[model samples]
Target: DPMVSKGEELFTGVVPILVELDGDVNGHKFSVSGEGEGDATYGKLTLKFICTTGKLPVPWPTLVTTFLMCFARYPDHMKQHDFFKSAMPEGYVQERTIFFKDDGNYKTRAEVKFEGDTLVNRIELKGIDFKEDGNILGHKLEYNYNSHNVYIMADKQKNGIKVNFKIRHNIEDGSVQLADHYQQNTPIGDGPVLLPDNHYLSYQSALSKDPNEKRDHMVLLEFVTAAGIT
Candidate 1:
């Protein structure tokens, strides 16, 4: 007879998809690509958004410069102007690509649906490495529940934009971790967007597999656009 003993085990783990705007939206275009690495305990993720058009509108250039910038700019301001009238002239375009990197990576392409700049109907990420149940450094890890919301508003001085969002990870054991993120005065550009040195989101949880053993599980993320936007 062979006897098996329980031991510690550890493991770790896109293409450019076109998302064109509705014909009513000036035929503007967006190209997205994403990839990721790591597992539930730790990992890294990256997402890219590229404007395929030549030159984007004033706020549009700034708006799609980065994921953070996209949320920073006010959607109402965009609605007030009629882009179809004189905003977009034939052969006028600007090249830009936005990047978003975080703690976890996605296993499948995200499904993004939007109506103009006002409504980002959905940015769904279903196939991701962050599972509902897993082990973190010998501690039982479980995301019993989670929820999030996106909001955009004026910055402290009202001279710039501010975007805020939060994801609550509720553990069955009663512990809670948060992916709280906010950005202000995000830079706008036709060139590749860059994240500041201090820019990053972190999720930490202090959990105990038992009274005698405990561990601190963490996920840290930081991302920037590629050098050029095509």
Candidate 2:
């Protein structure tokens, strides 16, 4: 029998159904609209694989929740988990990825909310910082959303995707110059408004069956975003 093995197996796994996926992504990827006006600027995100929770619907809270829950296992531990928790309605977020860059764009952030499969409101924003002078501890940036309420065409990869979200928080911010003399709560999003530094969340997972699996989701979200310089 399948369960007759001793010390060989302890659980079972089931693959989810993919109505129309990029071949077979028993895996998951979560990226949204690219840079507004650059090589990354494309339509939709790269990861559009379906989930087992089943198909989603309009005003799409279920889809959004599905995405959040699916990626719950993904590591990264975004600093804004609490932010989304307090600001976003319960069951609205399934999974997310926060990308950061120190290049021309300054910083790049994109969040994918499931709005059912029919359509999703993919949002992405680019920001620039303005550090103040004198002995202080504050900084400023201008956020302009490149993609808002984009009716993402499902089951498609939106061309080039570059992601460099986080390393260890403890180390990722090492290069970030500290400053003082600016606002810390200036809005940075397009539709769902914005939350402070500790408000964003990248991804989370509850599937413990695969404890050895690549729980460190950075492999996917932190790939090409900032590879050129390094």
Candidate 3:
């Protein structure tokens, strides 16, 4: 429970998407992670990337940005606000922002819904430009009380490539490989919304496959606090 009274609202602290993403598209093995926060939550997240094996056909920034948009709703659903109104008989449009690895900020405007009462899907982005490649579309999502992972996929055709991204929870040696923690504050200014401290993972590849060819990459994010200091 939060350190607050009964009448005061509770800030549960942003629980991030923690897991590993591994797959192949565009003939490369690319690994992704959040830059400052543990994992990319709904607020705003910074992604880091590195090529583990082959040459990435698309630029790292473009590849990662489109991938991030595919499942942008994950973090938003984790919070307490209505991101586009999932409550009304007919939902409304909600607007938000997202940050990528290289100071790339995106404005997300979507008509979202949840659980027939929740906002869970969308299309396109505003306040940025990338041509047909910049369209961020929401695919599918599953949330639960017993599940430990969030599986998601998308058609980010903006870069003329397809990517399958998965954020999940699993175990090895009878223990979880992904670590979790918390920072001082979140991206939307400052207040009760604190950041999560956890390991982040993203997988990107083409629609087709190549066994011999491989591309791999990883990014490390420094811990940050909203106080303006890391």
Candidate 4:
């Protein structure tokens, strides 16, 4: 009872909680729903972090506070910015859905599901393909949270290009942004292509050219969140 009282006291007074962590919380289902619009692609993006069904050993708020502290202090083995590992309780599940739409009325859906930390359970791609010069190039994507890499395969052949997924947290503004950095080419290859600071739903493109083929190409996606954070 005292622990509950202490937890309530931290957020009750006029004085603000000195530090408030702004990510997923334990014992709660966190979800984000937003739309992405850009020159080359447009559609909806969603994320859901579902808590476990079992009862917790401690109070939710206390567990959350402890988890946040642990996450903030400890460094992941890969030294990459991770969003789920520390915050998610054991047996928690995550679902990410991307509804992709391109020009010429082409549409597809991609889903990535995870269970208990970074264990990816399923990845489903529906109606994903690219057409060039009367040829249909089927595409497949593979992702791993531990490696933070997204592998893109075309026509069943590995592209050998790395797409690193990242989540950026702005502590001062209490905003979080998710991005996939295309690491092989383009000006944005060096870092995650985030939206403008403090802005949501900004269109960005990784535009480049294939030197051997002399063809210009681009990858585009706008970033937004249900909470209106970039």
- Where model 3 places Cα greater than 4 Å from the true spot, the runs are 1-19, 26-42, 66-230
Please write out the lDDT profile of model 2 over residues 1-230, one tens digit for every residue.
22122101110121121112111111222322211110111111223322223321111111222221112211223222222212222112212232223321122222333233222223322223321221111212211111111111111132111112232111223333111111111112232322222222233211111245332211111111101111
Candidate 3 lDDT over residue span 138-170, tens digit each: 101111111122122211222111212222222
Residue 97, candidate 1: how far off, in angstroms? Answer: 23
Maximum-lDDT candidate: 3
Best by TM-score: 1
RMSD of 1: 22.7
- Displacement of the residue 211 alpha carbon in candidate 4, Å: 31
CA error at residue 215 for candidate 2, angstroms: 30
Q: What range of 10 consecutive residues in model 1 has the weakest lDDT sum?
A: 1-10
Ten-residue region with minimum lDDT total, candidate 3: 136-145
Q: Give the clash count for each candidate.
A: 6, 24, 22, 0
Q: Rank by TM-score, highest first.
A: 1, 3, 2, 4
Q: TM-scores of all models? A: 0.26, 0.21, 0.24, 0.19
Decoy 3 TM-score against native: 0.24
| Backbone clashes counted, model 1 | 6
Question: What CA RMSD would you report for each candidate?
Answer: 22.7, 19.6, 16.8, 22.3
Q: Cα lDDT of all candidates, in order?
A: 0.25, 0.20, 0.27, 0.20
Model 4 residue runs over 4 Å out of place are 1-81, 87-118, 132-230
Of 2 and 3, the candidate ahead on lDDT is: 3
